[PDB]
Write a sequence for this structure.
């Protein structure tokens, strides 16, 4: 007994596995934290891989690094397929930890409460925000995705504005924006998905390379971190209680 989540955003037999675990220190007065695994390719059917992922054992250790507090993660496993998966890696503690409550330099076992597997396109079909940085040397506008959630327990609405890219826009194009916010673009934002990875991960399907999507490989998935906006939240609480209700955008003059 453990909740499991499988999101197949790609139909390929081969896919990029984006795996996030919500865990609880094995202890009285336990720390609660969320771990995401560095992305890895697999060809095992998703509904089968999730059974293997669910059966691993996880240990963490809080350490100090030039970046601040980090979490060393170790994953134990008897499943042959998970030779494919990183078993030692480090993640930022501020996003990972809810809380207190974890000691430094003590390897700590954690009980798995939930495991989420999202299937994305192959790594050569994934575009990041960093990928698009420096593509425009003199941009005039920033493009922001406004990710709207409902907290299902409180009924409160939450909007997380996340940076996508900066572009240059011709004066002529400002009057309707139809050459920037193309039909392709607007549809891609409206139908964008938010999945449990890196805290939360926005995934935009890039159907064209015109306007707002210039210099992106067509049919790539453009992936965007929201974890940096969730440092003060419990990720498990978020992935359980924040329902993604819409995605809007703003094209803001740089100022």
């Amino acid at each position: 007994e453990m909740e499991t989540y499988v999101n197949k955003l790609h139909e390929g037999s081969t896919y990029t596995a984006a795996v996030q675990y919500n865990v609880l220190e094995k202890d009285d007065d336990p720390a609660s934290l969320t771990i995401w695994v560095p992305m890895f390719q697999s060809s095992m059917p998703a509904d089968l891989l999730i059974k293997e992922l669910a059966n691993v054992n996880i240990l963490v250790k809080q350490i100090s690094t030039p970046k601040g507090p980090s979490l060393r993660v170790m994953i134990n496993s008897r499943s042959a397929v998970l030779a494919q998966m990183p078993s030692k890696f480090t993640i930022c503690a501020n996003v990972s930890l809810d809380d207190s409550k974890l000691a430094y330099d003590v390897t700590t076992p954690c009980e798995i409460k939930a495991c989420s597997l999202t299937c994305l396109k192959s790594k050569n079909m994934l575009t990041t925000v960093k990928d698009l940085t420096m593509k425009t040397l003199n941009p005039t506008h920033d493009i922001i995705a406004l990710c709207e959630f409902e907290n299902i327990v409180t009924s409160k609405k939450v909007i997380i504005p996340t940076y996508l890219r900066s572009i240059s826009v011709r004066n002529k194009d400002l009057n309707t924006l139809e050459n920037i916010t193309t039909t392709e673009f607007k549809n891609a934002i409206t139908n964008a998905k938010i999945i449990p990875y890196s805290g939360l991960l926005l995934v935009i399907t890039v159907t064209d390379n015109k306007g707002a999507f210039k210099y992106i490989k067509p049919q790539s998935q453009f992936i965007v971190d929201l974890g940096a906006y969730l440092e003060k939240e419990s990720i498990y609480y978020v992935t359980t209680n924040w329902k993604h209700t819409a995605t809007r955008f703003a094209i803001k003059p740089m100022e």
